[PDB]
């Protein structure tokens with residue numbers, strides 16, 4: 001066994017591969033040994049829970065984790081906190097009310113300001129549409145996930161700001177590229193004059209671009225993603241996507257590791273009612289243009 005463990009959502013998706021690299025790089029800078037694990041894919045909430053439960057019985061001083069849902073990791077995290085494990089919530093906010101109800105807490109929460117993520121994606125949409133506005137839609141992440149909830153809210157708030165913008169659809173596609181092409185096709189059929197789609201992550205955004213291409217509307221419909229994964233940025237630079245709100249998963253993972261290494265010295269876990277540290281990693285809007293001076 002090692003000193004620290006990390007439980008990510010997946011290990012096959014680019015966003016979570018980059019977070020794994022950020023953690024590994026930070027492990028060399030700090031000189032600590034980190035074991036990184038993940039479920040098979042995006043739907044295996046029960047498998048990630050059993051994976052976390054199996055780790056809490058080794059000898060890790062701290063465990064950072066990004067839960068697949070706000071609920072699947074509530075019990076194993078609470079049991080790890082009661083055991084004295086230094087816990088750090090990564091990216092996806094665990095249900096803190098239920099975690100407290102289960103008798104647990106976390107040292108810190110390292111994430112992106114996802115309300116600003118959605119606001120930036122929608123704000124870039126509102127500017128590009130101009131005074132005409134038009135119909136817009138929001139492709140949501142998995143239901144109940146605070147990351148997607150916050151991006152949805154931020155996009156809705158920025159859209160409600162402009163009076164010529166119409167929110168005709170807001171449906172989940174479960175971070176799934178195939179599901180997003182299906183949902184986006186439905187939106188194109190039910191709202192043929194739709195002008196722009198914001199997507200809670202790039203996996204879905206690329207699938208939306210597939211649906212837009214099938215309908216022959218590439219460029220007629222704006223497609224803004226989130227994460228800044230390589231395929232999405234190459235799509236943004238090739239015109240297949242309009243933009244993407246890039247996150248910094250490497251820094252999210254690297255910071256989460258350093259917090260466990262630092263707080264490991266404190267000799268004490270966080271009290272049950274002390275609100276955890278709240279670290280925000282900035283996000284930048286990636287378009288095919290890049291402005292300087």
Ligand SMILES: OC[C@H]1O[C@@H](O)[C@H](O)[C@H](O)[C@@H]1O
Nearest residue numbers: 009015091092147175201227
């Ligand atoms: O794994 C699905 C998605 O989860 C969110 O919490 C992350 O911020 C990324 O957008 C990721 O792509």
